[PDB]
Amino acid sequence: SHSVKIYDTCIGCTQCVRACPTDVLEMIPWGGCKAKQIASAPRTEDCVGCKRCESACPTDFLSVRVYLWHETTRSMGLAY
């Protein structure tokens, strides 16, 4: 499974969660930014690694980072 990580520069704009095509990410309450929320990656076994989320992220230096790692039939996106 690929690794996904969130860094605390995240402004909680949610754009990565909406971009994700397999629901890897969710918003969780946080006190660190004005939006009072931060991203989270509790379902990386469904993560395919398209990096649509990084494309969505506004922070100078990504707040969401995808490290491609061990391949499974889920990360490889196989339907067979």
Next chain:
Amino acid sequence: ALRFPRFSQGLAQDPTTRRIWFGIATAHDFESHDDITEGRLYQNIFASHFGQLAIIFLWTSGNLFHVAWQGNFEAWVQDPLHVRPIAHAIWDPHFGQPAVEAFTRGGALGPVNIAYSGVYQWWYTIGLRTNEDLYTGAIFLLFLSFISLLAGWLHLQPKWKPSVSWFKNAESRLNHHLSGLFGVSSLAWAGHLVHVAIPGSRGEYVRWNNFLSVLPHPQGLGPLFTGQWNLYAQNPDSSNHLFSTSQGAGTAILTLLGGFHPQTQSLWLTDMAHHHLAIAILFLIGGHMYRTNFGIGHSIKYILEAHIPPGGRLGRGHKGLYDTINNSIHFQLGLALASLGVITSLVAQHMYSLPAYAFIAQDFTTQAALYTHHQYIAGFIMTGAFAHGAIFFIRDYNPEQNADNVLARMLEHKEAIISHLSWASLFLGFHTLGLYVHNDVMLAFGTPEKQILIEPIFAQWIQSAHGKTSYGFDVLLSSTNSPALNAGRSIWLPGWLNAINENSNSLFLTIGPGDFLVHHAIALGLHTTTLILVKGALDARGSKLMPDKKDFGYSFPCDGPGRGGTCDISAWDAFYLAVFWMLNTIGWVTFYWHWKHITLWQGNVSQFNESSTYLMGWLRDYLWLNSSQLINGYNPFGMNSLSVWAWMFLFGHLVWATGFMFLISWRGYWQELIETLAWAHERTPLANLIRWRDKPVALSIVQARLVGLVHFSVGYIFTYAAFLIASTSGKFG
């Protein structure tokens, strides 16, 4: 961690065909296996070197064995200029009768291959004469192959596993490698030249059974120990000496004559014996520099630490560099590959111009294969040198322990470095291409006198400083009263001045405008290839487009289509790009070497001097002209011994072109296609019964770059080798 890649459970658990591919490709990257330690890393490398020695010895043993068993060495040594040397027999049941006849050459009783490796000239020059000589040599190397495997196995056993601290004892390894690996081996090699090779050249037969009863020199060791060393140079071979006979044979063992044995056209054996003795003394003294167990010698760390300019223009100088190097194996291998790459080119440049082996100068195809083989080997080795510099920067570099030192300061001004390589490459490309294109247009328009044809005056002035008189510059050794000329008049200059001004050897060939243009082509290739490689190494840790690149490692497919697109952003991809540029560069240098020599050998250098200043000349008068025998190795009218090279020539074009598929079409196209084949397979009766155990998937992004590169490189090399060998051997220059 239970199937195929035992060192990578990450891969063992891949359910796709990708598992098998990457298991193969990562097997030698020890650092990235499950649960490697520093100790295991060193120990695996150490045993892996013994296996590499074992293969090298095994390979040489077979070459000896096959020449003795199926070659014509004994006929070659009796008439070295009229016998094509045999590599080995061929036994191919696909052959038709006309192929059996055409390949039956030499004095052989069946189809054979002719050797372009030069081993006959090599082995003959150093003393080998009989098939038996070759047999016991092969057996001895077989023994060395076996011993190398014994030690490899041994040192992987817990009782004999060396500690990390031993592998990092740098001062001791240097002392031993300089004085022993280099020095004693060179001293011993001079001992072989004096005891066996030189008597062989004078028609004597010195072997293990009799070498104790025969003197290498009539005065024994007396002159050695009394200091009367001149006696060993006293009575050198005549310039009319006939190699392997006593005709004009002298008794000197150590000389300094310069130039060539006039009949063999290669260096004097007594010069080569003196050379190996002299450098041995230097290695043996030099190997006493570093401190070991005896309370004298240097600390390399202290030496580095002391070399910091007062005034601060190199910050902290070389402080920290001992452990940066001594703790990083990629740093060490980078320096090793960089240095070996330089001297592999040195070998190619010096062997064609100052051959050591009797009767190799007139074996034109051998000289062509040997030069081409080492310049391509050298090119690959140079790209590896930078690739492991990059890997060093990612895996091993510690910014804090290198703070402000010469290595860190390279990273600080990478934009200065990279943008000047960029500038130098742009300058050389615009002008070199601009000048060739101008000349082409002038030829096109029937006005060759309007070419731009710059004389390589700086190099011609260097040839004149060396004593060549072709250009009238009269400098240094070309002068009449330079102290340089006066000091060497009594020693090596008579034989050297003779060789350098003989214009039918390869020592310092005459050069004009054609040599100017292609040397700037070559400088373009060196500059651009290092641009790719330096930019690759210096951005490996990070760029503005990917400031955390170090967190992703040396090779990764990319960083996705965001931030504008990031294909081919890793340091591994910069290497991949540089291979094309290295293959380009060596292509230019080897084209040049070959075309300069084939027109030399044919007796009309003017074909090169005139057709090389424009590019249509290269295409037509080099490639097209010299392809006619090769492409007729088989035709609707039959075939001949050039048939193999004609077939390999096209084979090379085919492999190269197949590489283009993996390089141009990328993964997603092929993954979707494979899916329709997964469907089709699971819906086809009878074939339904059979099921794959590994899910079929398109190759990885990086994988395809590699597979394409390998196809490209393989076809590149096979195409040119087929052409090189056929064109040169079809006529003998």
Next chain:
Amino acid sequence: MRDLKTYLSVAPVASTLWFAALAGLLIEINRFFPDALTF
């Protein structure tokens, strides 16, 4: 007219006019002083 003068200043238009003028100049120098290899 001022819109037209703005368009005539756009990168491609200003480039052809500039390079056209340049080409004419270099062609006429080569018609008047052809075959110059030195200087």
Next chain:
Amino acid sequence: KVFSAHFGQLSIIFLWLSGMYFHGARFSNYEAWLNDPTHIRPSAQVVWPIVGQEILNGDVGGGFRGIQITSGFFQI
């Protein structure tokens, strides 16, 4: 937009044909070619003498010097 762009294309083609007929009229050996089509090579382009490029004006017959054309306009 596509309708008027089509007119734009047709404008370009007619201008292209105008030049083809104009070069046949003004810079060709078509009149000479009619008397000897088996030998005279169709030519309808002539290069100005500059930087040695006159050599592209070839001896095509009909007392003419020019580039041999292969568009086939003469046969039309």
Next chain:
Amino acid sequence: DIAGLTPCKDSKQFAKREKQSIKKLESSLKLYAPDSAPALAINATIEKTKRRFDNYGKQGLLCGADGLPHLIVSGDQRHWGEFITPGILFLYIAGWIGWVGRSYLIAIRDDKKPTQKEIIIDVPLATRLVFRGFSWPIAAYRELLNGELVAK
């Protein structure tokens, strides 16, 4: 002479080349009537060929065994027309272009939307900067001496 060459004015292969070239054009010349336009044109090429070969001979160009002029760029004072002199002219013009180019980016760098004058040339501004190039060696040396040329 230099690099074993000989002056093109003394070179036999140089003279042969001119002769073979004129003979080539005369083979075409003889196809056409002497008043005809092709005859005049081929004759114009012939005279230009003759002017060219005499010109290279009179300029001091050295020739190789090939009968072609070979340029001496080493610095030798008999051959400054082959590199030093046209090269000084190139650097003077090249620096003029670059200095003018930098003048324009600097002139517009503090404008409201600077990329607007990069895709739509402010030609009036450019006509005012185009002649700053005449003195780029003095202007560039002056900006250097007072910290204006390079940023820190």
Next chain:
Amino acid sequence: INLPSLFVPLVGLLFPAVAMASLFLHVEKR
């Protein structure tokens, strides 16, 4: 010929078949 007719089919047909079959079973094992 008495030995090439033995080793050429051995190293070019038998050994690769035995090797390819051996490696097929190791890579497929679990």
Next chain:
Amino acid sequence: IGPKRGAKVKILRQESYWYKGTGSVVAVDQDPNTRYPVVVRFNKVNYANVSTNNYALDEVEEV
């Protein structure tokens, strides 16, 4: 707290497109729970076509 509005600050976050350049302070979030409270605007977009970013007080230096 933080630099004043319209302050000209040099960027000291290494991985930032504008590292060692300068931008203008838009606002400073006064909530002391905000880890990166200094909003900065720059005149050139980064590779994501974004022109503004939040920075820490230690990542910004008035000039």
Next chain:
Amino acid sequence: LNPSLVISLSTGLSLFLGRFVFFNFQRENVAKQGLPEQNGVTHFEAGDTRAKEYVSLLKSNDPVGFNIVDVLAWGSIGHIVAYYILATSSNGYDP
């Protein structure tokens, strides 16, 4: 030239130089950059048991501590200088 005389005079002077005129300087420098270290620690201290300095050989009852390694080191320079002088005189080189 008598070889024994040249060799034994060269070695004599070299041994004399290393004992009476250059001894302090050579010792000072060896102390300055001492044993080779890997990561701040001598090869032996890191576990290279084969890197142990042979204190037994280094011991000497010579007043200044001139030991057997010094004799080998300065004695080698003497033999090298001697055989340079002998071989150089054996030839008839003319500059």
